[PDB]
Amino acid sequence: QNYGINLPITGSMDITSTLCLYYPTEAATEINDNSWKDTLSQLFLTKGWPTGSVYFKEYTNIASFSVDPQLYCDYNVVLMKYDATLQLDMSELADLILNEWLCNPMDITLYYYQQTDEANKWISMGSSCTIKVCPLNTQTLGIGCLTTDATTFEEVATAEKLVITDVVDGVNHKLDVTTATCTIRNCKKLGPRENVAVIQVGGSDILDITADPTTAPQTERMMRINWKKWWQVFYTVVDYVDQIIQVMSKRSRSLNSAAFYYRV
């Protein structure tokens, strides 16, 4: 209980959880049974999860879910339906919910903002996020744009529910986001979030959760299954819950000993 300090841990070589399951409304529509949640709860009970420990969350679309996706649970499994036209949206959602972000406010009408390093990004969430950026040189004049006129700005998003923006580091920008229907925050990626796993249904493993173009890492918590029946999807998840949990882990920020290290 010496919180807040990092002390070396020496080891010798010679020697009650809650699960949340997020699914699209299409799944419930196809199931077309109102007792399906209770059925899955009883199946999870057979797998060992006591009744009431499994929560079922429904979202209408990846677009809607991407608006501040709060996941309160010891373990979270998100069933993401693949659409070939939503590759970037799926990637951004996965990046936001599979990593821990420390976000600070942004007041675009009062300050110019730059990204300090590779771990820094601008995360914008809202009804309609339209982000236009004007880079400034060392004299505080636009490069390819005019600070006074926002039409000349360079548009990097349009009516986006969720957008992760990555401008060139070390250069100040003037932003012109739609603060009325969007909130933009200057975030830094601390690391992975072991609490959450994504199971894509359909598609061909198209997810880039790294802004680096030279890497498209496929973590153990990113899974993909071919599907035709949502009942079979849910049966697979229930039957292999043990493997999914083993792939995931408790949230380090949640655990005690995270006090004074950006807890929760």
Partner: protein, 48 residues
Amino acid sequence: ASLIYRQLLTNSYTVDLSDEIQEIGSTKSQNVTINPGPFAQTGYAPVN
């Protein structure tokens, strides 16, 4: 004096008999299965 713990553990099969004694006096009731599902929407026919 540990005999109390040992005997309390040993003679525990009588708990079942006490439970049966309570059960026989308990009032019993039954529940019928609940018709579930997204019931189809059927309304009035078109009339004049």
